[PDB]
Amino acid sequence: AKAQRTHLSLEEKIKLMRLVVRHKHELVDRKTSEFYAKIARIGYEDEGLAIHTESACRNQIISIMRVYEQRLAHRQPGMKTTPEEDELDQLCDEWKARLSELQQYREKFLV
DNA sequence: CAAAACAATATT
DNA sequence: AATATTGTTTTG
């Protein structure tokens, strides 16, 4: 997680996503934020990332997606395989699936 | 030099 | 209100 000041991000990104996926099942209709509001809570009370806010919990995770989709279409030569990058990719895929599953439900309700 | 990721902002 | 985005900072 880049941030204003940090030593290693790639590590933080994985740690953050490692929590979202582990809590992808958790979800409340009453309050959507109730989710991201919990991730930033356990992400700073266990991972010790630093400081995050509900809103920030929606921008950070969101940003990681844009990159995941961008580097997903690239699939171009000139890059080497890595364990860290591989894990992050897997975590993103799992999280992406959960988001899609929830979206499908919406379509069922309407049309 | 360039891309990635955050944190806040712009747009719907 | 919710999301991708936009500006700035960090990583590569």
Q: Could you check: is the Cβ of residue A70 within 7 Å of any atom of nucleic acid strand C?
A: no
Q: State the structure-solving technique.
A: NMR
Q: Could you check: is the Cβ of residue A100 within 7 Å of any atom of nucleic acid strand C?
A: no
| Alpha carbon distance A92, A65 (integer Å) | 7
Protein-to-nucleotide distance from the CA of A103 to the C1' of B11, whole angstroms:
21
Nearest to A23 by CA among A41, A11, A1: A41
Protein-to-nucleotide distance from the CA of A10 to the C1' of C11, whole angstroms:
8
Return the structure tokens found at A97. 């699936």
| Alpha carbon distance A37, A39 (integer Å) | 6
Nucleotide nearest residue A66, measured CA to C1': C4
Q: Is A57 exposed, middle or buried (0-12, 13-18, 19+ CB in 10 A)?
A: buried
Domain residue limits at A11 = 1-111
Task: Answer for the pair A1, A13: CB distance below 8 angstroms, yes or no.
Answer: yes
Residues 32-51 of A with CB under 7 A from strand C: 32-33
How many domains does chain A fold into?
1
Protein-to-nucleotide distance from the CA of A108 to the C1' of C12, whole angstroms:
43
Nearest to A39 by CA among A69, A9, A62: A62
